[PDB]
Amino acid sequence: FRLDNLGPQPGSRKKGKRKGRGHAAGQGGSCGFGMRGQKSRSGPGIMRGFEGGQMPLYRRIPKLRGIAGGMRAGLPKYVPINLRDIEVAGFKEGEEVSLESLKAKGIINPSGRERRLPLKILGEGELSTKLQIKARAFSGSAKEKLEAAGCSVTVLPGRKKYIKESVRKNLARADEY
C-alpha cells in the first residue's frame, strides 16, 4: 500500500458546495435564499421558536406540572432487570454478585452517579440459576421470583440518618405495641 496508490472509498466524502460561485452550480446569485426578506439579509436572523408576533407555542401553553419547585429527579437506585441479569452474561452461581461484581461483569455500568445509586432488582425477567444478592430493597414481584427460584437473597442496609434526640425519644414512647 504505497502512498500514491491509496484512495478513499466512493461516497465517503462529498465536496462541500460553495454558494455563489456560478449560475451553473445553481446556488449562485441568490444562493437559494431567494430575494430579500429577513432570511436573505446577512445576520443572526429571526429567533427560532418565534412566530413573528403571534404568541409562541411555548408561551401559550402552561408550564407542564408542578413547575416552580420539584425534585424532578428519577434514578435514586440504578435498576437492573433479572432477565438482563440472569440472561446474557451469566454468573457462575459461585460468585457473590452485587454492584461491584456487576460493574466488573459489564452488565451494568454506573458513571455519572456511582455514589447516588444503591441498585435495585426488578421483578421482570426470570433467572435460570439461583444466586445470592446483597443488593438493597427489590420489587416484590422481583423478590418473589428469586424466592421461587430459591436463590438466597439478602437485603442490605446502605445508610443511617441522624435524628434529634427528642424526636428519637418520642418514637420510643410510642412503643405501645
Partner 1 sequence: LIPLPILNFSGEKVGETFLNLKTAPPEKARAVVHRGLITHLQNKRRGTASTLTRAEVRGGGRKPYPQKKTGRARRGSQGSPLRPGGGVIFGPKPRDWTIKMNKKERRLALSTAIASAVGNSFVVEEFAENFEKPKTKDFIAAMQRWGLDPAEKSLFFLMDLVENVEKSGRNIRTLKLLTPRSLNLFDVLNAEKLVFTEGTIQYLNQRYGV
Partner 2 sequence: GYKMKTHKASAKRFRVTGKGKIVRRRAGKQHLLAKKNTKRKNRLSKLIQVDRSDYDNVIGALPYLKVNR
User: In the chain, helix, strand, coil percent, each to 5?
Assistant: 25, 5, 75
Judged by CB under 7 A, the residue of 165, 172, 173, 176 near RNA is: 165
Residues numbered 8 to 37 that lie near partner 1 (CB under 8 A) are 8-9, 12
CB 87 within 8 A of CB 105: no
Does 161 help bind partner 1 (rule: CB under 8 A)? no
Does 162 help bind partner 1 (rule: CB under 8 A)? no
For every residue of 69-125, DSSP letters joined together read S------SS---BHHHHHSSS---SSS--HHHHHHHHTSS---TTTTT-----BSSS
C-beta closer to partner 2: residue 62 or 150 = 62
99 phi/psi in degrees, rounded to 5: -60, -45
Judged by CB under 7 A, the residue of 35, 104, 172, 174 near RNA is: 35
Does 3 help bind partner 1 (rule: CB under 8 A)? yes
Residues numbered 51 to 80 that lie near RNA (CB under 7 A) are 52-53, 59, 63-74, 78-80
Residues numbered 2 to 31 that lie near RNA (CB under 7 A) are 2-9, 11-27, 29-31
Does 71 help bind partner 2 (rule: CB under 8 A)? no
C-alpha cell recorded at residue 168: 428519637
* Cα–Cα distance for residue pair 61/58, rounded to 1 Å: 6
Selected range binding partner 1 among 4-12, 20-28, 58-66, 168-176, rule: CB under 8 A: 4-12
Does 112 help bind partner 2 (rule: CB under 8 A)? no
